[PDB]
C-alpha cells in the first residue's frame, strides 16, 4: 500500500525539486488516500497543494484549496496568505487585501506578507477609479459590436475584435467583457441570426469562449438556459447545430470543451489532470453532458460535422488515461450504451447510413474507439469491452441474409470491421479470424452490387496487416483482390489497387493515371489513389521516380487542398518517405543496401527541394487538422527535414511553416512535439525574427526551444535553438521576459562553461548579450555575487578565436555603464591588469574597441580604479598615431578620465 502520510512528503519534496506539476498531482493523489478519519492530515494537504497550483498559475485552484484549509482552522496563516495572492491575481483585489491584511496581524513580521500588502495597497487605491474606466472601454465596444450602434461591417468587426483582445488581455479584461453574463445573450443573438457573417459569429463566440474558462462563470453558463438543469445542458450541447459551417461548429465545440474542463477541474492544453474531488461533486452535470452528447451520436437531425465533433469530444474528455475525465467514467460508458452507439457509428459510410456521415467521419470513430479500449486498463474491463463488441459483432453478422435488405447488414458488419481495424486493430483482428466472415466476404466480393464489390477489397486491403494468424482470410482474399482489380468501375479498380499495393512499378504506373486525371476521376477515388501510392513510397526507385514528374506533385497537392484529414496518414507518409524522415537505431557487409542513390547522399535534396517547389507545405497545413498523433509526427519530420537548405526556409516560413510547427508542438504526439521544435529552431536563425515570428507569434515560440535544450547531455539542435533564441531575444523585452521566467538560463549558462564547442558557446555568447540587454537579468548578473562578470571580462580577453570576444566584449562596455559593477571586479579580479592589457591593444578589431570602451568606463567612474594605471596608460597612448583603425576612439577615451 501507500500510506496517506508518506505520499504527502513525497510531494513536499516535489515542491522543493521545483516540479510543481507532480506536487499538485501528488498532493491530490495523497488526499485521495485519506478521508474523514484523518481529519487534520487534510487541511495541511490543501494548504500545500495550493502553493503548487499557485506556482502553475492555477489561481482558481489555489484559492479553492486555501479556503478549503481555513474551513478547518481559520488561523491557517499559510492559507490566508496564498488565498490572497490568488485573489490578487484573479483581479479580485478586494477581499484579496482584507486577506493579506488579517493574515499579517497573525505573524506581524514576515517580509512576505508585507511585500504583498504594499502591492495590494497601490491596488485598492487605484481600484474603483480604474474599474469604471474599463466598464466604459467595454460599453463603448459593446455598443458598436452587439447593440448595433455601429455603421459598416469592418467597424463592427474591430469592436468585436478589440473585445476579444481585451478579453484575454488580462484576468480583468475577461471579467469585464463577461459583463455579468450580459455577453452570453449578445452572442446567442448572433448565433441565432441567419444572416450574420461567419467570421462575426465565430469571433463573438471566441469572446464568450475565454470568459468561460472560469469554473464559476462556465458552470453558470451551462445551467443558465432553462430552470431545468437537464434541459439547460441540452441547449448548450445543441448550439453546434444552429449552423453548419465548419468554423462555426468548431468554435462552438470548444464551448462544450470548456464545460468539461470546468466540470472536472481539468485542461488538456495545460497538463492539468482532473481533480477527482470537483468532478465527483458535480457529477450530475457530467452525466447529463455525456448522455446528451451520446444521444446525438446517432440523432439523424444532428449533422455530419457536429457528428464528428461530438466524437472528438469523447476522445478528449472521457479517456481518463489521456488527460480526460477521471477513472471510472469510460467504464460506465462501455458498460451501458456508450460503446454500442459509438460502435453503430463505426458501421456507417456515406453511401449507406442511418444518420448523416462524411468520408472523414471514420477516422474520428477509429481513434476514439482505439483510445476507448486503451482507457480500459484493468482485466475485468478489457473483458466487458471485447465482450460487448463481440455481442455487437454477432447481432450484426446474424442478420446478413441474402436479400437487398439483408445486404445492408453485410455492408454494416463490413465497415464495422474496416473501422475496428484502423482503430483497436487487435480487437478487430480477433474478429476476422472467424472464417464465418470469409464466406460473406467472398459472396459480396463476387456479387454484382458494385458497392459490395468495392467495400470488400477495402475490407481485405484493410486487413493486409503485417504478420500472420489472419493471413487466413487473406489466403483467399488476396487473390480475390487480383480479380476485382480488372473491373471497369473506377471505384472498384482503385479500391482494389490498394492492398495489392500494400504488399510492382506497374502499380505505381496506375496510381498516377488516377491522380493526374484531376478533373475526370473524383475525390474519394483519388483518396485511395494516394493511399496506394503511399505504401509504394518506401522503395528508393519509386521515391526518385515520383519527384521526377511535376504534375504528380502538382496534383497530389490539389488532392490535399480539397480532401484534408482524409489523406493524412497517407500524404504524410509519402512526403515522410520521399524525404527520408523516419529513423533507425544507429565477416560482414551490407554497405550496398545503403545504396539506392536516391535514398542516400545528395538525392534527398533533389526530392526535398522539388517537393517544396510544388506546394508540399501548403498541403501539410491542409491535412494537418487531425486529432491524430503519428500523422502529425510525420508532417513534423517532413517539415523538419524540409528546412535545412537555407534559401528554402526563406519560403516555407511564408507558407505557414512557423504557425504549423508551432501547433505541432502542443498538438503532435511524443517525439512529434520534439521534431516540431527542432524544425522551428532550425527555421529561425539565419532568418530575421520579424519576418517570421510577428504579432505575438514570438511568445509561444519559446517554451519549445527551451524544453529542447534541457536534454543538453549532448546532441540535438541546441546550436540551432540558440542562434534563434539569440536572434529572438534581440528585439522586444516581452521576449527576453519570457526567456527568463522559463527557468531557461540556468541551462543556457552551461553553453558557456564549455571547452571545445567554439560554436555552441559563440551562441550562448551573442545570446546572453541580448538576454541582459535590458533589466530583470541585468541587475541579476551584477549584485548577487555570482562569478558571472568574471567571464564577460575574461572573454573579451580570452581571444584566440573571436566572436566570444566581440560578444562578451560588446557586453563589457554596455555593462560597465554601472558603478557597483567596477566594484566586484577590480577587487576580485586578481590579475586584471594582464587581462585588461590583453584586451587593451588586443588585435581583434572591435574587441580592442569594445574592450577599451569597456575599460575606459571602469576608470571613468570611480577614482580608486582610475588610479590603477599600471601598464594600462601605456596602450591609450600608443593607440594614437596611424593605426587608421577607430580603436583610437575607445583609446583616446581612456584619456579624458585622467582630469
Amino acid at each position: 500500500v501507500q500510506t496517506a502520510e508518506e505520499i504527502r512528503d513525497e510531494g513536499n519534496a516535489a515542491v522543493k525539486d521545483q516540479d510543481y506539476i507532480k506536487a499538485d498531482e501528488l498532493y491530490t493523489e495523497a488526499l485521495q488516500l485519506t478521508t474523514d478519519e484523518d481529519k487534520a492530515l487534510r487541511p495541511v494537504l490543501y494548504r500545500n497543494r495550493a502553493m503548487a497550483r499557485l506556482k502553475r498559475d492555477d489561481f482558481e485552484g489555489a484559492q479553492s484549496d486555501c479556503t478549503k484549509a481555513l474551513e478547518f482552522d481559520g488561523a491557517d496563516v499559510k492559507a490566508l496568505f496564498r488565498r490572497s495572492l490568488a485573489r490578487e491575481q484573479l483581479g479580485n483585489v478586494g477581499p484579496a487585501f482584507q486577506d493579506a491584511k488579517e493574515a499579517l496581524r497573525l505573524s506581524p513580521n514576515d517580509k512576505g506578507i508585507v511585500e504583498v500588502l504594499q502591492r495590494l495597497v497601490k491596488a485598492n487605491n487605484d481600484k474603483i477609479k480604474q474599474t469604471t474606466s474599463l466598464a466604459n472601454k467595454v460599453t463603448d465596444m459593446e455598443k458598436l459590436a452587439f447593440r448595433g450602434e455601429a455603421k459598416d461591417t469592418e467597424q463592427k468587426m474591430t469592436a468585436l475584435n478589440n473585445l476579444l483582445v481585451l478579453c484575454r488581455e488580462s484576468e480583468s479584461g475577461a471579467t469585464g467583457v463577461w459583463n455579468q453574463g450580459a455577453l452570453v445573450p449578445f452572442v446567442l443573438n448572433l448565433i441565432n441570426d441567419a444572416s450574420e457573417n461567419e467570421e462575426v459569429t465565430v469571433t463573438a463566440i471566441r469572446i464568450l469562449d475565454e470568459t468561460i474558462k472560469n469554473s464559476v462563470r462556465c458552470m453558470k453558463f451551462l445551467a443558465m438556459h432553462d430552470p431545468d438543469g437537464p434541459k439547460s445542458v441540452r441547449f448548450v450541447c445543441r448550439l453546434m447545430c444552429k449552423k453548419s459551417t465548419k468554423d462555426f461548429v468548431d468554435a462552438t465545440g470548444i464551448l462544450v470543451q470548456r464545460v468539461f474542463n470546468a466540470m472536472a477541474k481539468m485542461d488538456r492544453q495545460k497538463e492539468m489532470k482532473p481533480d477527482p474531488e470537483v468532478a465527483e461533486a458535480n457529477k450530475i452535470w457530467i452525466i447529463r453532458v455525456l448522455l446528451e452528447l451520446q444521444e446525438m451520436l446517432q440523432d439523424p437531425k444532428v449533422g455530419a460535422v457536429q457528428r464528428e465533433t461530438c466524437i472528438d469530444l469523447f476522445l478528449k474528455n472521457l479517456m481518463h488515461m489521456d488527460g480526460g475525465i477521471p477513472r471510472g467514467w469510460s467504464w460506465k460508458f462501455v458498460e451501458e450504451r456508450g460503446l454500442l452507439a459509438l460502435l453503430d457509428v463505426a458501421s456507417q459510410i456515406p453511401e449507406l447510413c442511418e444518420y448523416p456521415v462524411s468520408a472523414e467521419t471514420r477516422q474520428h470513430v477509429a481513434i476514439c474507439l482505439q483510445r476507448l479500449e486503451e482507457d480500459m486498463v484493468f482485466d475485468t474491463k478489457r473483458t466487458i469491452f471485447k465482450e460487448k463488441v463481440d455481442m455487437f459483432f454477432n447481432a450484426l453478422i446474424s442478420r446478413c441474409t441474402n436479400d437487398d435488405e439483408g445486404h445492408k447488414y453485410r455492408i454494416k458488419l463490413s465497415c464495422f470491421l474496416i473501422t475496428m481495424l484502423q482503430g483497436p486493430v487487435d480487437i478487430g483482428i480477433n474478429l476476422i479470424t472467424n472464417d464465418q466472415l470469409t464466406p460473406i466476404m467472398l459472396e459480396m466480393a463476387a456479387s454484382q452490387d458494385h458497392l459490395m464489390q468495392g467495400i470488400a477489397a477495402e475490407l481485405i486491403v484493410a486487413t493486409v496487416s503485417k504478420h500472420e494468424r489472419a493471413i487466413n482470410m487473406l489466403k483467399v482474399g488476396i487473390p480475390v483482390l487480383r480479380a476485382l482489380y480488372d473491373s471497369e468501375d473506377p471505384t472498384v479498380k482503385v479500391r482494389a489497387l490498394v492492398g495489392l499495393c500494400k504488399i510492382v512499378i506497374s502499380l505505381a504506373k496506375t496510381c498516377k493515371k488516377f491522380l493526374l486525371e484531376t478533373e475526370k476521376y473524383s475525390v474519394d477515388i483519388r483518396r485511395y489513389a494516394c493511399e496506394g501510392l503511399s505504401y509504394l513510397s518506401l522503395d528508393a526507385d519509386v521515391k526518385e521516380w515520383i519527384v521526377d514528374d511535376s504534375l504528380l506533385l502538382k496534383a497530389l497537392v490539389l488532392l490535399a487542398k480539397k480532401a484534408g484529414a482524409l489523406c493524412v496518414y497517407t500524404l504524410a507518409t509519402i512526403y515522410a518517405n520521399l524525404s527520408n524522415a523516419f529513423e533507425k537505431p544507429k565477416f560482414a557487409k551490407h554497405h550496398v543496401p545503403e545504396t539506392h542513390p536516391k535514398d542516400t547522399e545528395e538525392y534527398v535534396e533533389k526530392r526535398v527541394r522539388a517537393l517544396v517547389e510544388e506546394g508540399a507545405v501548403p498541403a501539410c497545413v491542409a491535412v494537418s487538422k487531425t486529432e491524430s498523433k503519428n500523422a502529425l509526427e510525420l508532417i513534423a519530420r517532413s517539415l523538419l527535414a524540409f528546412a535545412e537548405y537555407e534559401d528554402l526556409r526563406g519560403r516555407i516560413i511564408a507558407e505557414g511553416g512557423t504557425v504549423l510547427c508551432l501547433r505541432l508542438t502542443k498538438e503532435a504526439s511524443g517525439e512529434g512535439k520534439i521534431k516540431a521544435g527542432h524544425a522551428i529552431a532550425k527555421l529561425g536563425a539565419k532568418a530575421d525574427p520579424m519576418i517570421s515570428f510577428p504579432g505575438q507569434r514570438a511568445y509561444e515560440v519559446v517554451k519549445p526551444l527551451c524544453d529542447l535544450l534541457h536534454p543538453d547531455v549532448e546532441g540535438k539542435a541546441n546550436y540551432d535553438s540558440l542562434l534563434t533564441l539569440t536572434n529572438l531575444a534581440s528585439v522586444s523585452d516581452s521576449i527576453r521576459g519570457r526567456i527568463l521566467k522559463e527557468k531557461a538560463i540556468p541551462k543556457i549558462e552551461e553553453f558557456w562553461f564549455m571547452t571545445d564547442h567554439e560554436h555552441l558557446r559563440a551562441a550562448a555568447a551573442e545570446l546572453l548579450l541580448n538576454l541582459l540587454f535590458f533589466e530583470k537579468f541585468y541587475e541579476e548578473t551584477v549584485a548577487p555575487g555570482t562569478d558571472r562578470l568574471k567571464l564577460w571580462v575574461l572573454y573579451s580577453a580570452e581571444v584566440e578565436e573571436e566572436r566570444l570576444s566581440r560578444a562578451s566584449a560588446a557586453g563589457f562596455a554596455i555593462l560597465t555603464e554601472d558603478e557597483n559593477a567596477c566594484a566586484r571586479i577590480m577587487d576580485e579580479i586578481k590579475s586584471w591588469p594582464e587581462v585588461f592589457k590583453d584586451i587593451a591593444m588586443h588585435e581583434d578589431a572591435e574587441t580592442q574597441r569594445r574592450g577599451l570602451m569597456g575599460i575606459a568606463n571602469i576608470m571613468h567612474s570611480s577614482n580608486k580604479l582610475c588610479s590603477e594605471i599600471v601598464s594600462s596608460e601605456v596602450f591609450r597612448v600608443l593607440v594614437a598615431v596611424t593605426k587608421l583603425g577607430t580603436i583610437n576612439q575607445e583609446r583616446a577615451g581612456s584619456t579624458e578620465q585622467a582630469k
Partner: peptide
C-alpha cells in the same frame, strides 16, 4: 519564523 513560499 518561516517566510512564506515553503510548504509544511
Amino acid at each position: 519564523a518561516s517566510r512564506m513560499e515553503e510548504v509544511d
